[PDB]
From Swiss-Prot, chain B:
<protein>
    <recommendedName>
        <fullName>NADH-ubiquinone oxidoreductase chain 4</fullName>
        <ecNumber>7.1.1.2</ecNumber>
    </recommendedName>
</protein>
<dbReference type="GO" id="GO:0048039">
    <property type="term" value="F:ubiquinone binding"/>
</dbReference>
<keyword id="KW-0812">Transmembrane</keyword>
<keyword id="KW-1278">Translocase</keyword>
<dbReference type="GO" id="GO:0008137">
    <property type="term" value="F:NADH dehydrogenase (ubiquinone) activity"/>
</dbReference>
<feature type="transmembrane region" description="Helical">
    <location>
        <begin position="351"/>
        <end position="371"/>
    </location>
</feature>
<feature type="transmembrane region" description="Helical">
    <location>
        <begin position="224"/>
        <end position="244"/>
    </location>
</feature>
<dbReference type="Pfam" id="PF00361">
    <property type="entry name" value="Proton_antipo_M"/>
</dbReference>
<dbReference type="GO" id="GO:0032981">
    <property type="term" value="P:mitochondrial respiratory chain complex I assembly"/>
</dbReference>
UniProtKB/Swiss-Prot annotation, chain G:
<comment type="function">
    <text>Core subunit of the mitochondrial membrane respiratory chain NADH dehydrogenase (Complex I) which catalyzes electron transfer from NADH through the respiratory chain, using ubiquinone as an electron acceptor. Essential for the catalytic activity and assembly of complex I.</text>
</comment>
<feature type="transmembrane region" description="Helical">
    <location>
        <begin position="140"/>
        <end position="160"/>
    </location>
</feature>
<dbReference type="InterPro" id="IPR001516">
    <property type="entry name" value="Proton_antipo_N"/>
</dbReference>
<dbReference type="GO" id="GO:0032981">
    <property type="term" value="P:mitochondrial respiratory chain complex I assembly"/>
</dbReference>
<keyword id="KW-0830">Ubiquinone</keyword>
<protein>
    <recommendedName>
        <fullName>NADH-ubiquinone oxidoreductase chain 5</fullName>
        <ecNumber>7.1.1.2</ecNumber>
    </recommendedName>
</protein>
<feature type="transmembrane region" description="Helical">
    <location>
        <begin position="413"/>
        <end position="433"/>
    </location>
</feature>
<dbReference type="Pfam" id="PF06455">
    <property type="entry name" value="NADH5_C"/>
</dbReference>
<dbReference type="Pfam" id="PF00662">
    <property type="entry name" value="Proton_antipo_N"/>
</dbReference>
Amino acid sequence: SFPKYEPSRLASLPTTLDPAEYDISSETRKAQAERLAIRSRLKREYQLQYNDPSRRGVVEDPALIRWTCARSANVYPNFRPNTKTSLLGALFGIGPLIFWYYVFKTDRDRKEKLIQEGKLDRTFNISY
Amino acid sequence: MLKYIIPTMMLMPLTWLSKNSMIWINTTLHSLLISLTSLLLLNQFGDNSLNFSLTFFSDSLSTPLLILTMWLLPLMLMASQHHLSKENLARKKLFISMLILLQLFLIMTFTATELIFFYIMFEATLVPTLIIITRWGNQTERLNAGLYFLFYTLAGSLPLLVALIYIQNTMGSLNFLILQYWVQPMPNSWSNTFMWLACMMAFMVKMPLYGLHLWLPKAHVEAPIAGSMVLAAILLKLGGYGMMRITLLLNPITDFMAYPFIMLSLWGMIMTSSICLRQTDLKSLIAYSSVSHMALVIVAILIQTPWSYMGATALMIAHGLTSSMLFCLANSNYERVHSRTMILARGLQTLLPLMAAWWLLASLTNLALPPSINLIGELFVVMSTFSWSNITIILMGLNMVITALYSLYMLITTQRGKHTHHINNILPSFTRENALMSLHMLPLLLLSLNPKIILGPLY
Amino acid sequence: FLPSAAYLTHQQKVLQLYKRALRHLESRCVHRDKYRYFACLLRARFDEHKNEKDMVKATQLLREAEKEFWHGQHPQPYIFPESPGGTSYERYECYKVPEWCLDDWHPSEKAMYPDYFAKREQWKKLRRESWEREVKQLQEETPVGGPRTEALPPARKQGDLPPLWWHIVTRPRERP
Amino acid sequence: FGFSIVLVLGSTFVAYLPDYRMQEWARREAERLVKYREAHGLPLMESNCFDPSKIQLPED
Amino acid sequence: DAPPLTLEGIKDRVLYVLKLYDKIDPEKLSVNSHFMKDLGLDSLDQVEIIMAMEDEFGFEIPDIDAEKLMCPQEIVDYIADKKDVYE
Amino acid sequence: SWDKDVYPEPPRRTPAPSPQTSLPNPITYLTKAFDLLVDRPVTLVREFIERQHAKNKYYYYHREFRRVPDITECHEKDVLCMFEAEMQWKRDYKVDQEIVNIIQERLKACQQREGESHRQNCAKELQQFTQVVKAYQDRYHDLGAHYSARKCLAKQKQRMLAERKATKEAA
Amino acid sequence: MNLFSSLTLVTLILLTMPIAAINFNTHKFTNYPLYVKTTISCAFITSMIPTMMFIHTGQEMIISNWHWLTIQTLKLSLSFKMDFFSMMFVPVALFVTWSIMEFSMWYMHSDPNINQFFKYLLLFLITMLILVTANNLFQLFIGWEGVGIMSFLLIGWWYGRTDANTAALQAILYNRIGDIGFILAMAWFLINLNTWDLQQIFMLNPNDSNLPLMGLILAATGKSAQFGLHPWLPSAMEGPTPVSALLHSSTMVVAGIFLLIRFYPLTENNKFGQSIMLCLGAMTTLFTAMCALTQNDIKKIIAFSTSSQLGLMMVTIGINQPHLAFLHICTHAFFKAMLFMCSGSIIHSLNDEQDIRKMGGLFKAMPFTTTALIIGSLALTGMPFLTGFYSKDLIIESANTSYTNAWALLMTLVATSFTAIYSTRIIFFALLGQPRFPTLININENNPFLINSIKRLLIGSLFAGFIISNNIPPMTIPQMTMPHYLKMTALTVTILGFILALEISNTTHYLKFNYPSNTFKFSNLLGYYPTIMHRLTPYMNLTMSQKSASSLLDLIWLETILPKTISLAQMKMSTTITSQKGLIKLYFLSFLITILISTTLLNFHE
Amino acid sequence: SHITKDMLPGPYPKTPEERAAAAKKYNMRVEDYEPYPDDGMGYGDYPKLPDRSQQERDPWYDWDHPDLRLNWGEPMHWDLDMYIRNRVDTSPTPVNWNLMCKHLFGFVAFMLFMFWVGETYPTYQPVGPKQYPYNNLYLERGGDPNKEPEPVVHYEI
């Protein structure tokens, strides 16, 4: 009665029709218990260092600091020049540049040859 | 002009022989007096430049930039406290005298006559900025920032000296009129191509162009506020001033040899507006915005229309004020929280309910709100480049759209929607930062009323 | 994804399906009388095999129920104008000012509102007076070397306040 | 010394000053010149701004 | 858009919509009564009651709570927590 | 005021409305009350300010310059001739642009005053506009940004040599 | 006339006092809403006079002063022009906004941020006036981007609410695509007519004009919620109610078609251009009419209706009939300002719940508002013959008597039927159903400001269409000679729409629990355009921002080409030159081989 | 301050100690730590997450950061600046994605083809051109005061 909801990279898969939520093994119960334990301990540390009346500054999350240091400063190490990296670099860095370069050569050669003929609409073209 | 040079000297021993709680009023008061003193300059008329000596003169390109420099100094000097007021007295005096010597070589550079004197004062403009950003770089890679900075600017600006000495001993002296009144066209031999490439490439380094724009972002994210404002406004528009002067020579080959640089500038303007849509480190978004506006500047310089040069100098002055202001607001936010990141400091429509007015005003000038000068600049550059080619307007408008979106994202990311409610240390807005905003955005609107001053030599 | 346990259960999963199908039947069906008819029909359809001692056939019928539900949902399920996704979604968040402010005022306005700020000062002394010993001892006292839960025990010991309560109590009033 | 002596005085000083790049001088000079070239019949804005008697084309 | 709620008023409105429900009686309808012990109705109609509260007052309550209300006094307490009922 | 010779005006034409109504005429009542309640005090204040300025007399002179000869009477490098020549040429360039401005202002005035019949009694002014702009397009257009005087004379020589070759081939 | 120019310039300058007043006040005035309302009323009574003078005689005049940067062969002054559109549109906009000032006095009673709200709304009015008056086209561009950014601020009034500033971001983005179209138009006008001014553009009519016409088309379809660039419109309905009312009653919604109306001598000819006009308008009208069916939020319905009416005006520009489109602007303005104001009255009457489900029966819950909405929604499609009759039906019959494109006629047919059926459905579901709305009723409209505002706009929308349409100077030749079954067809389509929505209603009375047939889904779920575009175009540019732009091209490759090659070369050459252990025999053998290789191999003495 | 070993050099290998260190470092499950892998695109060793995650995380959990669904300690998926709600909303769609794109492209293609069919086939109510009085209304078009009379007339019919 329904084509079973093909997913995509944009359409998220909702929590109802997984259908992996219904094959509950003991490993999934173990993983959900340990995940609740991790969230419990993190909320405990955060709430104890969040409700202190002497605490003046910010709580200084290492998660945001770690993500930012991974995002900006930890790119250039580490790296190796692979076939995929070099290929995508020379494609998305040089391709559009040389393409736009050739098409502006074409447009400029058209306009230069055409006004060298003199038959352009520059009867008054003062604001050059 | 020595009437402006020598009090800028005599403002330096002032700072030495004033004491604690006594340097400050002296420096700020007297620098504002020098701002009035160069507001007296604007006399320039009609036929030519005005010659303040056998040695100095002023084109009308140089007058608004010089007034902008002497306007920007006291603003900067008040801006650079609360992050060094708790440091030592001798080091604070050394900082202030470093800025004064910096301004002095900037006046030296803008009021040049000979291009060799211009080059000496170009790298004399360079050397205080280095010392400021390295001594108070305030982050762990100020080492690499200063190193990249000095080696890019010198090693790009190094063969410029050789090309200018060659022009010196093939065409007589190097007064700008005797560079004019005697210049003859030079054909398409490859030595002419390398000479043009040397001069234009040194100033390409100093704009920056797109292939050498990673000079910039470390040198602004790891700089203090004074060196950042100096660097952005006065040094990038000084590089544009230099290319605007020395593009008088070598016009018969710039058409044949200017094709790759325009395309690099256009596609890199698109790529730079794209790259400042998604980054963290909010301080760097203004730096990539500056790369975008200077790419538009370089398009305007390599096309050689009077329309293009008027739009170029208006874009220079408006973007200088916008970038210096917006750097100062980013320093205000970093004084609030010790983050420098973008997604952390949020809220602030409730709290500090008039700081948001200055963020909105800066964001709409960076939008180029239409009575402002930035839209005047961008509009005349788009007009001149559409007369250049009937096709480049796709890139200009797509720059306009992405510029609107990242400037608006800067506005409504950090200062819209919800405070993170674990901040609880931000103070209400001081009188000082509000005074700095008021010193920024009164002259921009007052030139928005009457902008016939700031247009270039081809008025 | 929930604070209490690592999963909902089968029971609450079926229950959330029943709530969603009943809400979508509201969003499908106006005039409320045929709605009441169809709601009792849906109740009977779940009454057909409520008492299965089996479990695998029950969860397979749950999956086929999700298929016939997702085929038969509504484009605008009727979200209330207080819920996220809905019309409000913190509609009057313009005035939801946090209360770490209001102490950074000039003492002229602290003279304008004297009694409120005196009582607020004794609130903050109540906060700091029982902050260190009781709260941090009850946090570093009860649990295992890993906490492994997102609840927290009360201060049932003798006296003062249950721990970690300040940003729970001192919230906006949700209509200012 | 930053607004009360700089801002409003600079606003008056740059709101008006003499004819920057000879503007209204050129206005009234063009007025008088076009009035002259209407009052003496010759066509306004004569092309070939340099005198063709004082020119020497190189030959083939 | 601010009508003032009060504890007696919310008690009266919740007991009104419970008394309007069919298969209970208006005789043995206590404030301190169970939805499991003495009223004897099932979990299904209990969550129908939860749906009646959500549809009257205008907000969802989460399923971490809908397991464990089971009495009208804690219903009144929980909408008192969602609304913060004092003037 | 101005010179009406260089700023011409068409002769004035005004009718008189003749009702043929009995409401009558509210806007005439309103414009009489407007004149009596607005135009009188501004007239008295202008009389006051005219006396207060005509108590003493100033003058501003129209600046006039001489005619230093030409670039064609200047030598090889010899800047002291070229400087006078090029500033003379550049002042001619600015006054020539303002001549074009005046012609375009006449064209706008002819568009507005002649009304929705566009091609009536503007065709002589359109004719002289196309004449002067043919001159400007031929003379000052395609030199670019760094015009000093020398590219203008190069354009002059190249243009008249091309026209000489054209009429030599046509003959 | 001195009276004419004097009264127009003081209608400008009366919208200048209150902003500088509360920027200079610092003592918070209690009567600030009363003050802004009475200065808008004074602007209205000053603006009524010269329009009546205009229709009384003509005398059609421009003002132009304070030229700044008269640089090259052009010049630009602040200049605006009193012809017909900028002449007698301004009273309608001032009248509408004056009633919205009343309705926003009442509706925003419970916020201390009311003063900044009225400052933003009056500033938006100033910029809309400077947009609609100017002939110097730079001033038009000033008004353009100013009303765009005031739209941004007033949509994002309620900070918080991530959906709201998302929506305002969409609105300002489609404003910038309007900007790229408009600056392309300005570029062509400058480089081929030595200015950007309306008078010289009208003076010289060029032959090839396809590039500026495409620029103007892009500007209109960006500005005025048209297909391809439309879906910022429910986005624009995310904000507050009187913001939405002024945002899509007259101001900021007609500015896209205002420009194409203003350039009617340029769009006289170029039949390719008029074909683009009316085909695009038919596409907009059918898509928003088909999307408007099966919607349950009120403001989304009223916004889809105003997009449909704007599509009718695009078709009206496609036929050479601009003045009927301006007539439609005025009637439409009165019309949907009154409609939004009635809707907001209902919504704030019922605790800001806003949805049609959980609103069902509200007739005789005081019937001032139910009367107001049935007046408005039967003025939709023009109950013959009211103010809504004239614009819509003379437009469709003149389109029928035109060299049309044979498909746009059927598009207007189906669109008139659709706007009939959702009008009747929204009346039925709103008012005369059975009452489904939660208890503790707090319905109240015994309120002087609301009855004044609704009274004023029903009195406006009942008479002003006939009053304006009567005394226009005849700027076109009316057709008036239609065949049989081609003049009846307007009333035919509206009556069959009423009957069709009636039978859909009486099938809604039934009980079956039918199923979605995917045309239901295409009508209800915006069909697929905002979802697909707003989930694909953000992901693509930011996929290219992360991989290609930021982490790949600039940083790591530009650092591995310009620094790293130099740094590795210097490091390796240092570690192979100066990494020599300290023995003497090495140094003298190096001396010996250097002497031999300098004497005989690469000689220095020959 | 911040520990030097709370930075992140190098990818996954080898498997015991480096994956144990990344599990201790990024605060994740051991066998749910996923590097990208090492194709040399930079990327460090930062985890792969289920990549949509933001129209997920149903909003009644009452976590800490109210508009980001944070919980102060999650490893925070690499592309988070593209995933704040107000940037990209990856909701599970009510229909599909392929069905969406196929029906949208089909409808727009059909309407543009019917526009072309309209463009080749106009309507007209059957009426000749207007009878302009003076030579197709000459002397009031673009100019020509005395250049050429252009004789063309109309006859009463």
